[PDB]
Design a binder for this molecule. Structure first.
Ligand SMILES: *[C@@H]1O[C@H](CO)[C@@H](O[C@@H]2O[C@H](CO)[C@@H](O)[C@H](O)[C@H]2NC(C)=O)[C@H](O)[C@H]1NC(C)=O
Ligand SMILES: *[C@@H]1O[C@H](CO)[C@@H](O[C@@H]2O[C@H](CO)[C@@H](O)[C@H](O)[C@H]2NC(C)=O)[C@H](O)[C@H]1NC(C)=O
Lengths: 49, 49
């Protein structure tokens, strides 16, 4: 177990249906920012380096 | 996070303010070699190639 950051989507009944690692790749580092799973075309802003 | 959304929100309108002025032009025309259109001299207004 490692201390990373996950985003979780809950259903209508409080069941975890899907999850995203916020430290896997830059695409999934983006989904944790806007709080969505499907993200439109453009430049979005993420964390700085 | 909230500060960089504010300044990049300001910065994005500085592209929109410039496109709504100069980019009213569908097509690029060539520079005419003629510069006295009836004696009206136009070398100072056209770009000097
Ligand atoms: C959340 O749980 C409820 C149960 O309380 C689900 O509702 C039932 O779903 C079954 C199968 O779809 C139906 O046959 C029942 O008629 C439903 N009952 C009611 C009262 O709605 C519901 O589908 C669950 N939702 C999610 C997203 O898991
Ligand atoms: C438009 O006016 C300009 C004024 O600068 C004229 O340019 C000069 O013309 C003289 C004589 O033709 C030349 O000796 C200079 O070298 C020119 N200067 C430059 C910067 O080019 C130009 O001839 C005029 N054009 C027309 C069509 O009337």
């Amino acid at each position: 177990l490692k201390p990373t950051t996950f985003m979780l989507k809950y259903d209508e009944n409080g069941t975890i249906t899907d999850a995203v690692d916020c430290s896997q790749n830059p695409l999934a580092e983006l989904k944790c920012s806007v709080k969505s799973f499907e993200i439109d075309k453009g430049i979005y802003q993420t964390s700085n380096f | 996070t909230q500060l960089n959304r504010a300044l990049s929100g300001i910065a994005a309108e500085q592209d929109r303010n410039t496109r709504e002025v100069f980019a009213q032009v569908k097509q690029m025309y060539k520079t005419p070699t003629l510069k006295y259109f009836g004696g009206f001299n136009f070398s100072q207004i056209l770009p000097d190639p």
